[PDB]
Design an enzyme around this catalytic site. Structure first.
Site, PDB file in Angstrom:
ATOM      1  N   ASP A 129       2.833  53.350  20.050  1.00  0.00           N
ATOM      2  CA  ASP A 129       2.489  51.927  20.222  1.00  0.00           C
ATOM      3  C   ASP A 129       1.632  51.778  21.470  1.00  0.00           C
ATOM      4  O   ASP A 129       1.370  50.577  21.753  1.00  0.00           O
ATOM      5  CB  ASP A 129       3.663  51.096  20.438  1.00  0.00           C
ATOM      6  CG  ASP A 129       4.300  50.526  18.959  1.00  0.00           C
ATOM      7  OD1 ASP A 129       3.407  50.714  17.954  1.00  0.00           O
ATOM      8  OD2 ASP A 129       5.380  50.072  18.941  1.00  0.00           O
ATOM      9  N   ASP A 141      22.087  40.729  15.879  1.00  0.00           N
ATOM     10  CA  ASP A 141      22.404  42.083  16.288  1.00  0.00           C
ATOM     11  C   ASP A 141      21.996  43.259  15.762  1.00  0.00           C
ATOM     12  O   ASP A 141      22.723  44.242  15.901  1.00  0.00           O
ATOM     13  CB  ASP A 141      23.676  42.454  17.102  1.00  0.00           C
ATOM     14  CG  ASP A 141      23.825  42.695  18.552  1.00  0.00           C
ATOM     15  OD1 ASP A 141      22.719  43.203  18.938  1.00  0.00           O
ATOM     16  OD2 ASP A 141      24.733  42.418  19.257  1.00  0.00           O
TER      17      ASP A 141
HETATM   18  O1  LIG Z   1       6.154  48.339  22.001  1.00  0.00           O
HETATM   19  C1  LIG Z   1       6.976  49.268  21.760  1.00  0.00           C
HETATM   20  C2  LIG Z   1       8.153  49.164  22.942  1.00  0.00           C
HETATM   21  C3  LIG Z   1       9.231  50.408  23.080  1.00  0.00           C
HETATM   22  N1  LIG Z   1       8.971  51.077  21.901  1.00  0.00           N
HETATM   23  C4  LIG Z   1      10.178  52.247  21.906  1.00  0.00           C
HETATM   24  O2  LIG Z   1      11.522  51.437  22.082  1.00  0.00           O
HETATM   25  C5  LIG Z   1      12.475  52.284  22.824  1.00  0.00           C
HETATM   26  C6  LIG Z   1      12.692  51.428  23.947  1.00  0.00           C
HETATM   27  O3  LIG Z   1      12.340  51.958  25.082  1.00  0.00           O
HETATM   28  P1  LIG Z   1      11.795  50.379  26.522  1.00  0.00           P
HETATM   29  O4  LIG Z   1      11.051  51.058  27.556  1.00  0.00           O
HETATM   30  O5  LIG Z   1      13.155  50.152  26.977  1.00  0.00           O
HETATM   31  O6  LIG Z   1      11.004  49.537  25.499  1.00  0.00           O
HETATM   32  P2  LIG Z   1      11.220  47.687  25.879  1.00  0.00           P
HETATM   33  O7  LIG Z   1       9.902  47.091  24.924  1.00  0.00           O
HETATM   34  O8  LIG Z   1      10.986  47.624  27.349  1.00  0.00           O
HETATM   35  O9  LIG Z   1      12.833  47.260  25.498  1.00  0.00           O
HETATM   36  C7  LIG Z   1      13.512  46.969  26.525  1.00  0.00           C
HETATM   37  O10 LIG Z   1      13.083  45.755  27.174  1.00  0.00           O
HETATM   38  C8  LIG Z   1      13.833  45.491  28.332  1.00  0.00           C
HETATM   39  C9  LIG Z   1      12.826  45.645  29.762  1.00  0.00           C
HETATM   40  O11 LIG Z   1      12.162  46.803  29.578  1.00  0.00           O
HETATM   41  C10 LIG Z   1      15.080  46.201  28.516  1.00  0.00           C
HETATM   42  O12 LIG Z   1      15.704  45.893  29.795  1.00  0.00           O
HETATM   43  C11 LIG Z   1      15.802  46.501  27.407  1.00  0.00           C
HETATM   44  O13 LIG Z   1      16.735  47.614  27.577  1.00  0.00           O
HETATM   45  C12 LIG Z   1      15.093  46.655  26.413  1.00  0.00           C
HETATM   46  O14 LIG Z   1      15.120  45.703  25.261  1.00  0.00           O
HETATM   47  C13 LIG Z   1      11.566  53.568  23.239  1.00  0.00           C
HETATM   48  O15 LIG Z   1      11.764  54.645  22.320  1.00  0.00           O
HETATM   49  C14 LIG Z   1      10.143  53.056  23.180  1.00  0.00           C
HETATM   50  O16 LIG Z   1       9.477  54.232  22.849  1.00  0.00           O
HETATM   51  C15 LIG Z   1       8.179  51.050  20.872  1.00  0.00           C
HETATM   52  O17 LIG Z   1       8.220  51.869  19.829  1.00  0.00           O
HETATM   53  N2  LIG Z   1       7.056  50.245  20.954  1.00  0.00           N
END
Ligand SMILES: O=c1ccn([C@@H]2O[C@H](COP(=O)(O)OP(=O)(O)O[C@H]3O[C@H](CO)[C@@H](O)[C@H](O)[C@H]3O)[C@@H](O)[C@H]2O)c(=O)[nH]1
Ligand SMILES: [Mn+2]
Ligand SMILES: [Mn+2]
Length: 352
Positions: free
Chosen positions: A46, A333
């Site tokens: 992504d 959820d």
């Molecule tokens: O656009 C995206 C974003 C994340 N991921 C995947 O989802 C997972 C989550 O990783 P993370 O860094 O936590 O992505 P976020 O979009 O930032 O999700 C978080 O967003 C908040 C701020 O980062 C956090 O507090 C929460 O734990 C969580 O919902 C990973 O495997 C990532 O590779 C995707 O595939 N596409």
């Protein structure tokens, strides 16, 4: 018998998700003890990061050496960083064995691979002004992270070159779904739904498994053990043939990371373009033993796979609402996992 498995890995940011850790997960997947045509690895990016594309390219090239080595010598675990951390006893051998010779060469090959990946990370640290440029000379299509076309690239597999013993390897598919201003992408949930569709166009395995990019397969027999349950301390398991019924399991079950589950449970049903406007994908949902139509060229399939990751594909559909990984911030959820509907057969086997 052994059914095909589509393995999903989502990545977004090589700065938070180090390319080498992802590579080790991918290598443990490519080297799994399973018929190579029946396991496929889909990596969603992504971030549309050239660094991730190129490190996945380098990873597939190193797999061509690493995979036959692991299978010849029954190596565990098949993530090289962790294998090579374990101490070996050289003193018990009078002379250098064929295994020790092969292992010393493999270890330097891995050290050289690591240096190349470090170099890719270093070069990525600082933009050129015109954005990135590829092998070809042509510019990287994901230079604008929020405004870029869909990208798909198949490595290895039937037409991707042989391993060091002349044998084919499992497919490794790079996917970066289209991103355009004005379209929501729903993060990992939207990536997973895109991967459900891409995989359905290209392989359409009856079973799906989603691994985090740092969750390397620790035991190369994990898929065989799962199939021992899925086909007619301890780990999570579920089996259900649902009909009618105030009896038995009521309603849906939601499944997250690290579990093999059956694909058709996602398609649980209430026209048919609640699935979106893809004839090929809707047809794929109707094959109860999976697979793709024999008379599709990789070229036409790559069409269709690109179409199903276009940024507007899910508009007016049930994706993220009742189908696949479900979109939230309201009531539901989920988008902690795929929604497996009651309608028919459901089966899950989770790894330790
Ligand atoms: O656009 C995206 C974003 C994340 N991921 C995947 O989802 C997972 C989550 O990783 P993370 O860094 O936590 O992505 P976020 O979009 O930032 O999700 C978080 O967003 C908040 C701020 O980062 C956090 O507090 C929460 O734990 C969580 O919902 C990973 O495997 C990532 O590779 C995707 O595939 N596409
Ligand atoms: Mn949407
Ligand atoms: Mn994940």
């Amino acid at each position: 018998q052994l059914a095909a498995v589509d393995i999903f890995v989502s990545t977004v940011d090589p700065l938070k998700e180090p390319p080498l850790v992802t590579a080790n997960t991918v290598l443990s997947i490519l080297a799994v003890d399973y018929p190579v045509d029946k396991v496929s690895c889909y990596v969603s990016d992504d971030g549309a990061a050239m660094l991730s594309f190129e490190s996945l390219a380098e990873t597939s090239e190193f797999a061509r050496k690493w995979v036959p080595f692991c299978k010849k010598y029954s190596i565990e675990p098949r993530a090289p960083e962790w294998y090579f951390a374990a101490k070996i006893d050289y003193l018990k051998d009078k002379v250098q064995t064929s295994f020790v010779k092969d292992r010393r060469a493999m270890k330097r090959e891995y050290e050289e691979f690591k240096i190349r990946i470090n170099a890719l990370v270093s070069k990525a640290l600082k933009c050129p002004e015109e954005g990135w440029v590829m092998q070809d000379g042509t510019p990287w299509p994901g230079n604008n992270t929020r405004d870029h076309p869909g990208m798909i690239q198949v490595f290895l597999g039937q037409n991707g070159g042989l391993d060091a013993e002349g044998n084919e390897l499992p497919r490794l598919v790079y996917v970066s779904r289209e991103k355009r201003p004005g379209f929501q992408h729903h993060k990992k949930a939207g990536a997973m739904n895109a991967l459900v569709r891409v995989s359905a166009v290209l392989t359409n395995g009856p079973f799906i498994l989603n691994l985090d990019c740092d969750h390397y397969i620790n035991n190369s027999k994990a898929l065989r053990e799962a199939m021992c349950f899925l086909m007619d301390n301890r780990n999570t398991v579920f089996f259900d043939i649902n009909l009618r019924g105030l009896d038995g399991i009521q309603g849906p079950v939601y499944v997250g990371t690290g579990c093999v589950f059956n694909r058709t449970a996602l398609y649980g049903y209430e026209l048919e373009k609640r699935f979106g406007q893809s004839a090929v994908f809707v047809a794929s949902t109707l094959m109860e033993n999976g697979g793709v139509p024999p008379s599709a060229t990789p070229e036409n399939l790559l069409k269709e796979a690109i179409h199903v990751i276009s940024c507007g594909y899910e508009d007016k559909s049930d994706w993220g609402m009742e189908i696949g990984w479900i979109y939230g911030s309201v009531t539901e959820d989920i988008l902690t996992g795929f929604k497996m509907h009651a309608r028919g057969w459901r089966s899950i086997y989770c790894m330790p």
